[PDB]
Design a protein around this ligand. Sequence first.
Ligand SMILES: C[C@@H]1NC(=O)N[C@@H]1CCCCCC(=O)O
Ligand SMILES: [Ca+2]
Length: 602
Amino acid sequence: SWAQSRDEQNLLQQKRIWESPLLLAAKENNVQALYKLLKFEGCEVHQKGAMGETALHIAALYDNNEAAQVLMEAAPELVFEPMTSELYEGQTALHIAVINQNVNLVRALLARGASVSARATGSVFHYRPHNLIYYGEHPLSFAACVGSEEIVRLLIEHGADIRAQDSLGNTVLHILILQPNKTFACQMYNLLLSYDGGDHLKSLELVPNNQGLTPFKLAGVEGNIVMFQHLMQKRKHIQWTYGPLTSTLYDLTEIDSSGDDQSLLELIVTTKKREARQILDQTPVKELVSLKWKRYGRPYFCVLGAIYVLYIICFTMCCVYRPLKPRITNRTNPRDNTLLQQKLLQEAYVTPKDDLRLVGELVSIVGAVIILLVEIPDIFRQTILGGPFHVIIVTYAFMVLVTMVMRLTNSDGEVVPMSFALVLGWCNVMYFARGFQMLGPFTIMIQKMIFGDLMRFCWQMAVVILGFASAFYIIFQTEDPDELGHFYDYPMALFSTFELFLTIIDGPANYDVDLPFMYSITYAAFAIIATLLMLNLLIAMMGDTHWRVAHERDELWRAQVVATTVMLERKLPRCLWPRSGICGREYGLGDRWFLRVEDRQD
Ligand SMILES: C[C@@H]1NC(=O)N[C@@H]1CCCCCC(=O)O
Ligand SMILES: [Ca+2]
């Protein structure tokens, strides 16, 4: 493995230090022994250790300034020498002195003129999980991360370019946000901005990542609240202060739209980082997504919801009435348990009532491709948060097409693909349960919250039985209802599935008869979903009062509503859903869009 190798190497290095008396005296800070080695013997002062390190690199590790100065006085060319090893390719004796915050050694190394642009591309320095710290590749970046402002100043005085990026395209400002001590990195963040070019052109806070992220945008994705709040200070202007009230104005530039992915909100909803979800609760953002949902967001979800309900309830209205004929085959006693009256008329134009189902069948097709026309071109440019609605809706429209392909071929098994589209269409409309109110001046958790989680179940339950009672009816609409007639007509198919949803009915079972291939599959999935919804509901009934974890269930649901709010903003045209905030083009303050927020203090 790779972990053992460096563990072998770190142990291998200490051996060469123990062997090489120069490296040993450099580690032990033996000034008397060093003068014996370099002056009375002429030992290899260019002695490369096991990590390709010089005696000065060792003296820089263990803060031995006396021994380190002996190596520099007797050999001043060791300063420029970097370590040649693969794990440490690039690190010089300056990076070590900056890491250990040895101000006098750094002052002495800059005195002899050490390169402040020495990039350290060693394998141990890469931004990888096995590496504990990630400080970058330049000695200035090492100084900012250790919090030594005195070293930072000394490096800038020697021309340390603050605009320098590492291999991952991160400037020194990006690296500070990734450090744990965000409380202390805020102070170090301002110190580097003071050395900026002072021009509107080429601002260091505007320099993007290799993945196209500025220090602002990265702080939101990384979930660094203190850096995000700090960065917000220079992104807002206070209009006025009227007693307690303070009407501030937020820039709202790198936090909205006008980009394929140039948008912080799209990054928060798609990240695998759980910490980043706390960003959209901040005081320039929690007002934004709330206004996007309160108007234009909440109504269009119900409009598209009612359309999708009428779409699915029509597809079922055409599924309940399908071609019916007796089995017209003497094969009713061969396999006597057989009891099918299979029916595929496959060409009937009997149109007193079939023209009504003919136009309905075309609605089921033109919408399924429309579902594909709004989902298939979206997969090319996938995270559920967010709901698996998108995954379930595309397979539904895939099933309607298969049922269409199962038609025009008269395949005996057109019940199998038509059944999967029934539950996939309905179970997708329980995804429409999220809505109503997400406002929260007071994040309210009481009896209202238990009642809130119970009504989603009633919505989830009523939807599930509609998708499965219609399914169970189709399966047994063909068979003979004299034996196992739990679903002989639609009102009894619902009442049976309703009863079976609560496990009161024994469940349709008959063993002297052979039942269709679909009943065992559908009822097995029915028992799992029906118990999970009852099991999931039992947690919400208790997970609301035992602790403030109701706020944890609440805040994740808001992120689901916010993730849906960003979903309704991509495919919808521009004539609807106007842009958030107010533009800055006459009145003159643009060319950005600003959000007006006023708060009160007590
Ligand atoms: C101690 C080792 N000896 C040495 O001369 N350089 C190494 C420094 C170790 C730093 C490893 C930083 C990391 O985990 O990436
Ligand atoms: Ca029973």
